[PDB]
Design a protein around this ligand. Structure first.
Ligand SMILES: O=c1ccn([C@@H]2O[C@H](COP(=O)(O)OP(=O)(O)O)[C@@H](O)[C@H]2O)c(=O)[nH]1
Lengths: 7, 704
């Protein structure tokens, strides 16, 4: 469940 | 026994059948077959009209004969296929269509019918391919043309859009003159620039298909109640739906049966669908005074009888021309008052419907000519949603401040949870931002914020902080399937972030989570104008369906937008869908056909929605929602005004904060999401309808 980019 | 005797009967009968007297056509055809049994064309024609009469088992026997007698009879294979499809044997229909095509490769109708099976099954490209084949083979083919048009609308292929719209109108106009069943479906007619007159005429002709199917039952009129004496002063309301289950309709009105006042009302839910096992069905079954599974009573005669025996005063049609409808029930008039409500955003066009429940904003008197029914106005909006009950975890949010020395945003990192207050009270340092009752807790960037962010970034399912369960908002389905669908309220705290969906952290997000079929070229132009005037803003859309994305991205490039200006996300479970609306700044409503359920979904997240109401019911719902909410500044008189409002909300961050705060307060404070108030107003309206009937009046507009 990966995000499209890193905060 | 003679062949040309029988031949003559067949021609006499294609005559009666052409006129429109279906009943005599049958008697002729049947004499033709006593005279010449091995008469393929008679068997095929008798079968065709038996199918219209809904005598499928008998039609199927005669198609089989036609084929036995004439094995090259592609036409009979094609119509036998359609009979099997209506009988739910899609397997057998498919075999019929394919066999027709092998025997006669040049036979267009079988290609069209193969396309319809694909279309029904969600295979839109496979449908487009077969409709295109049918039209190469037979270029004047309205059924194929209009179904291809709807396929193209669904995937947002706007090749020759204006010419296509012109031709759909032309086909409907020709078909209404020439007295055929129009190839445009009434539900689809809201999408094309037909006249109000034409849309109502299309509806009326679909209604008449029910009359053919109930005339074969030869039932007399029912005696209706004239008073409330046998029901103890209680008005008997019958809600009829194929959608008591996991369907939008239930996500709107599942609380209403239970909220009816037992002193004055007795509520019957007539389900047209079997129990799908979901809590939506459980609740309606549990809370209605009576629940009747009409799926177990396939005969419209016996089902209408059952309604009539229950002694219904007002029967409410929640399907209109949608999948699962049994309008035959309503055509048999088992109740003295029969009302359209909520599920179908158009007119029945039919004599057997008395009222449509709507409101002054949705259906103003100036456009009454588009409805065959009398208007019955609810005081605010006819629209309602169960969001207060299904999604109470979104009544309050908190955020994380991660920019630190920068902005305190309300929609980049969001926490929601029934136990959020307790989790916050366990934290050392929580800034509370007053909202010039209401306030947004702000978790500062401590090591706890880092752990939450870590979870989101590593894509972990969940973590634990001070004993509280913290869920990744992308994993709701693994943690609690029932919470994901809206059947349960989530029992964890859920984190939702722009990073999860690839939305830019430093930009205005304009969302539209509708099905792409509601977009036309003009709408995307409007959106492109807004994006060009609000640099770095993005438009957030859904793969709904996915094959629509490349089409929209292409039209957008031709408008001069780089690819990254439109961001597509997959369709999600109900709860993720409603929750992730919290990430948007503004929602841009589709003027062609508004967000309906979708409108209530974005407003529940506190997301302002800009709409331009048109003339159709379907184009005015979002404005009706917004006037009830109390946000008249989000309603545009024209495209210029729409673009201006959108652009103002994207450029003036102080105005955006004010309008977002308005929506966030008023979703609770206004009537829009108040099921108890809604039910009580619906009750006030039911009693008007009834008093009017009891005083011996035919139905008339109810505006007071
Ligand atoms: O990612 C999404 C987008 C939408 N929906 C739901 O899918 C249904 C769409 O129904 P429809 O197209 O009838 O929307 P309406 O026309 O009522 O706005 C609604 O219940 C939405 O809540 C969803 O679960 N996930």
């Amino acid at each position: 469940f990966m995000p499209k980019y890193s905060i | 026994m003679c062949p040309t005797h029988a031949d003559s009967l067949n021609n006499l009968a294609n005559i009666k059948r052409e006129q429109g007297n279906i009943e005599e056509a049958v008697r002729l055809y049947r004499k033709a077959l006593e005279v010449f049994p091995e008469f393929a064309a008679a068997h095929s024609n008798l079968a065709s009209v038996l199918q219209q009469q809904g005598k499928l088992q008998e039609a199927l026997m005669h198609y089989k004969e036609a084929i036995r007698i004439s094995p090259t009879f592609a036409d009979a294979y094609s119509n036998m296929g359609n009979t099997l499809k209506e009988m739910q044997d899609v397997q057998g229909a498919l075999q019929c269509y394919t066999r027709a095509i092998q025997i006669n490769p040049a036979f267009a109708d079988a290609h069209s019918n193969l396309a319809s099976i694909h279309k029904d099954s969600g295979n839109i490209p496979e449908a487009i391919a077969s409709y295109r084949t049918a039209l190469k083979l037979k270029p004047d083919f309205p059924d194929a043309y209009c179904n291809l048009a709807h396929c193209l609308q669904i995937v947002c292929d706007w090749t020759d859009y204006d010419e296509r719209m012109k031709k759909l109108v032309s086909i409907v106009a020709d078909q209404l003159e020439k007295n055929r069943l129009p190839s445009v479906h009434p539900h689809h007619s809201m999408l094309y620039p037909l006249s109000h007159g034409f849309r109502k005429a299309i509806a009326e002709r679909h209604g008449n298909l029910c009359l053919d199917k109930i005339n074969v039952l030869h039932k007399p009129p029912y005696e209706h109640p004239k008073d409330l004496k046998l029901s103890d002063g209680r008005l008997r309301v019958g809600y009829v739906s194929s959608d008591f289950g996991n369907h939008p309709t239930s996500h709107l009105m599942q609380s209403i049966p239970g909220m009816h006042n037992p002193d004055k009302f007795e509520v019957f839910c007539y389900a047209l669908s079997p129990d799908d096992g979901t809590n939506f069905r459980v609740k309606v079954m549990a809370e209605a005074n009576h629940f009747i599974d009409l799926s177990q009573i396939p005969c419209n005669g016996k089902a209408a009888d059952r309604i009539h025996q229950d002694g219904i005063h007002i029967l409410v049609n929640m399907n209109g021309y949608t999948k699962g409808a049994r309008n035959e029930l309503f055509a048999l008039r088992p109740a003295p008052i029969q009302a359209m409500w909520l599920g179908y955003p158009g007119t029945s066009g039919a004599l057997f419907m008395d009222y449509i429940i709507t409101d002054q904003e949705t259906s103003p008197a100036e456009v009454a000519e588009q409805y065959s029914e009398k208007l019955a106005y609810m005081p605010h909006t006819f629209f309602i949603g169960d969001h207060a009950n299904m999604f109470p975890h979104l009544k309050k949010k908190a955020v994380i401040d991660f920019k630190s020395n920068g902005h305190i945003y309300d929609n980049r990192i969001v926490l929601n949870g029934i136990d959020l207050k307790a989790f916050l009270d366990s934290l050392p340092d929580v800034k509370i931002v007053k909202m010039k009752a209401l306030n947004m807790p702000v978790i500062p960037m401590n090591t706890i914020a880092e752990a939450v962010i870590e979870m989101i970034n590593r894509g972990q399912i969940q973590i634990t902080i001070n004993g509280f369960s913290i869920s990744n908002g992308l994993a709701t389905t693994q943690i609690n399937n029932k919470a994901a669908t809206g059947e349960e309220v989530p029992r964890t705290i859920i984190v939702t972030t722009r990073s999860q969906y690839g939305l830019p952290e430093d930009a205005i997000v304009y969302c539209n989570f509708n099905q792409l079929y509601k977009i036309d070229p003009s709408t995307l132009q409007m959106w492109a104008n807004i994006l060009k005037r609000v640099p770095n803003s993005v438009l957030w859309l859904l793969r709904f369906p996915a094959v629509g994305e490349p089409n929209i991205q292409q039209y957008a490039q031709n408008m001069g937008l780089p690819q990254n200006r439109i961001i597509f996300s997959p369709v999600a479970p109900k709860e993720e869908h409603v929750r992730r609306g919290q990430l948007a700044d503004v929602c841009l409503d589709t003027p062609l056909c508004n967000g309906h359920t979708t409108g209530m979904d974005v407003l529940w997240a506190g997301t302002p929605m800009v709409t331009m109401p048109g003339e159709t019911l379907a184009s005015r719902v979002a404005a009706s929602q917004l006037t009830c909410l109390g946000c008249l500044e989000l309603i545009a008189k024209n495209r210029q005004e729409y673009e201006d409002i959108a652009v103002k909300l994207g450029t003036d961050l102080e105005y955006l904060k004010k309008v977002r705060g308005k929506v966030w307060k008023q979703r609770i404070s206004s009537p829009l999401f108040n099921t108890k108030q809604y039910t009580m107003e619906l009750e006030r309206l039911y009693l008007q309808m009834w008093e009017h009937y009891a005083a011996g009046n035919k139905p008339d507009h109810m505006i007071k």
